[PDB]
């Protein structure tokens, strides 16, 4: 195409490091915590986003232009398939990327008593229920599209997620913050770190899949306006920001923690 | 390994006196150094330090400014200099080395017993 | 305890001593036999090692 | 056969 | 594929069940490490919140909101401590007590809890302060003898911390040596690392009831900064 | 002043000997060339920093001890867990294997040697006798036999026990620090022990009196062993420095050091030749040296916190590896 490869190249990027993301965890012996387990469960709904979106687009290069021929049948049928890989993947990397938040705050404000609620084995029991919840909505979103209720779900989700993974990083910033203002006043001795942190993970989250689902809830909202429908015609970036996600979010959760960093040199050297 | 420590005496108050440890047996510049002192019917107590390469060097609050204390590790000897003397510093003085090199803490020097410490130097204000 | 250490060491002193030439000797000698027994230094065909 | 879904 | 191997495979895989029953309830367990002098009054502390619940270590097993402390103090040891305190590397919390009523030995307290701060294994260990006592200080500040200013030249020029929060009806002159001892301490605190742990300064008396949940506030404290530093949020 | 001069002549004059015979630039021997070292298996189970572990004498059986409480013995074979007794006091610093595999000691900051037997197959493992008397933390507990034990401690003295009464034989009493390793000869009548101050004393158990006195090193020493002959030991010390001595020169042969390493040596073992002194450091991995030309010989790195345990085995096969990482690794030569 075109511009094709803008699909394709950030796809490949999810290569390079989701992979890794993965074999990070199941490499390194201590990196078997609740959160860990559910940054790899990230690491693969990234990947499949990344891996179904561009297979999609290869195959629309592919039929729409005269490189293979194929009954219109089957095309529906494959069609629906890679649809329903994407939401599939997408709504996992949405539920486990909300499970990194709530372990954090879980780990934080019962600090003590931690281990006593969540341990690895109940971790990978909330991984296999997100999968397995996540395999049903996408099917379900697919089976039934054109359905006002359906993107209704897919619009409540993000929005009623995007709230939690907000005020979660919230309340764990501010208090963090009463922790500054204690170290501050401290004899012979700024919430920058924290403030940037929070940030950037509030807003890779935004500037990646709040256009989409914004196209999606303008196309029940205002159809019929040419405002909305200026934005609508965006829809292209829209996806492309969605596989940017998946570049985004290691970098954000994975390539931070000097764990993570040292398993992943160990793995470099190799 | 064996620290000795050289000078001592009786002086009036107001005196003033050389403290001269030297130690053998090891590199004497990897190791932060203290001197210790017992008075009669009391415990061993901390007086001064240096570290390894007079980079920091410290003291208890009764001996802040008027003692002095440095090192010659190129002589592989360390020095206190004593001046005005008072009553309370009729004592034994022990140059103690500290267990690890490289390191920034120190045990053990007030301990009853320590591992490689001076025999002392008696110091007597009139 | 001043007695008790001055007869340690009037009886650590009178001890033998043979030459350091004569113990380098010795050591030299016990690493160079049983040398080729030593699964570490060799390694041995992994048929035989319990550990593969 | 478009490009994602709802475009 | 055989019987005896069978039967070896069989309690190892009882073995490795107990194991993991095991380590549930050690991870959630927190061991905190006692430390002292003759004249700190460690043994009142011990035996004031042991209502929660030749040999040469004393284990204090005590529950505070269900998170289940195991404290060990140490008794029937040599002088030396350079050597059996990194068994303690991994412990939540250093407990020191401190007796800051004499001003005579006040100083060498000072050293040990800077040899206990500055040592490896121990760089990321917080180590919570108890000044106990603060009655015996009080009585001999009232009495008007035995000034600080003897013992530390710099308590002259040196005023109450405008964070100090002293209790009514108590004197300047106690608070201001009450603070000038604690910032002591902490000035040894805040000087060394670098965000890898904190010193945790009370003021504890020898009747002082609620003394646990000061190890368990500040366990808390002391974990929550940990987690907050690692998700760089602090 | 009369009896410290005297100490001072004999110091001297003991000096004066040892080095009169000091009669290393030899070539004859060759290299030992890279060591190869390979983790073969890797034993995971343990809770928290495994700080004592001892092989078995079939060479295939190992007891690990474990700041969590926990003594473990292991099959190196099959990596299964043979056993898993839960100690009184969490904080054990050594473990024995009886020679005759029957019988397994365990003692720490409890100042108590406890003895577990293996063998009863009636309920599980109990605990047989609880050796009392030492007044600091045990170091090093060693079996003579199924009746003996040496044991080191935190109160400057070894002791000669004996389980089957409950008391104590011989004392031994020649050291002014803490004793922290002691190592049986491989003839199984005097036992070498390092102290923290840097000394290392003889100690025949049918007398009790100190037979030689070491020194050279300049900190704590912190592990001991015998070489495969009873006729030299190794000692590893916080000064970040191993050093050989030899009894019949009763001097210093051969100090094993770099201006790399600047941590201290955590413990100290011997291959069965002789020719691979094993030392695990506090920079969190194990380093092989080669005892002859005084070099380096290899690394065992694979530990991501300090290296406590280090054991070759009897036949020489297994190289096992504690660390407060939590985990046991045998290694092995490819
Ligand atoms: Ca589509």
Known sequence: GIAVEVFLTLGVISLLENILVIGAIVKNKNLHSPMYFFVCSLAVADMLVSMSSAWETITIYLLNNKHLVIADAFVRHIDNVFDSMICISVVASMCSLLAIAVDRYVTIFYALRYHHIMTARRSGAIIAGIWAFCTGCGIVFILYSESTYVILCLISMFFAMLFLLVSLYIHMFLLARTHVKRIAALPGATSMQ???????????????????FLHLTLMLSCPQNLYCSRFMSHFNMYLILIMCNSVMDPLIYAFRSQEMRKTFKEIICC | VQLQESGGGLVQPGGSLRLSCAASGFTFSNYKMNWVRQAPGKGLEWVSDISQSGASISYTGSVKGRFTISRDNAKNTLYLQMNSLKPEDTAVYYCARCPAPFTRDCFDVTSTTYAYRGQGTQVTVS | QARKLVEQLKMEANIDRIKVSKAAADLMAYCEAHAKEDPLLTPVPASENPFR | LDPXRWK | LSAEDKAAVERSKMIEKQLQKDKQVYRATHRLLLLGADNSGKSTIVKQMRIYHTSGIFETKFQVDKVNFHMFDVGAQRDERRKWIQCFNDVTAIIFVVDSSDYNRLQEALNDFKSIWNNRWLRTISVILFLNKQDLLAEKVLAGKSKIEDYFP????????????????????????????????????????????????????????????????????????????????? | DQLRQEAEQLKNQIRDARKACADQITNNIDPVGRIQMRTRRTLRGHLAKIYAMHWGTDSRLLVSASQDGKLIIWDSYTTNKVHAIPLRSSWVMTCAYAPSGNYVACGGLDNICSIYNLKTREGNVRVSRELAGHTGYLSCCRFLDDNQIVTSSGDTTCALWDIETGQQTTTFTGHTGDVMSLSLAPDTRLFVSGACDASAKLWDVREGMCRQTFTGHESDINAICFFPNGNAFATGSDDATCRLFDLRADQELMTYSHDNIICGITSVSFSKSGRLLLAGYDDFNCNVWDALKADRAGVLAGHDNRVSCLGVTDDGMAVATGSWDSFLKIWNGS
């Open chain 1, 194 to 212: 924290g403030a940037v942190t929070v940030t950037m993970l509030l807003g890779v989250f935004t500037v990646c899949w709040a256009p989409f």
């Open chain 5, 154 to 234: 710099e308590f002259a020029r040196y005023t109450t911390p405008e964070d100090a929060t002293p209790e009514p009806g108590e004197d300047p002159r106690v608070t201001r040596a009450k603070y000038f001892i604690r910032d002591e301490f902490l000035r040894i605190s805040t000087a060394s690392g670098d965000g890898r742990h904190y010193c945790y300064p009370h003021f504890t008396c020898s009747v002082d009831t609620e003394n646990a949940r000061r190890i368990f506030n500040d366990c808390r404290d002391i974990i929550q900064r940990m987690h907050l530093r690692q998700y760089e949020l602090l």
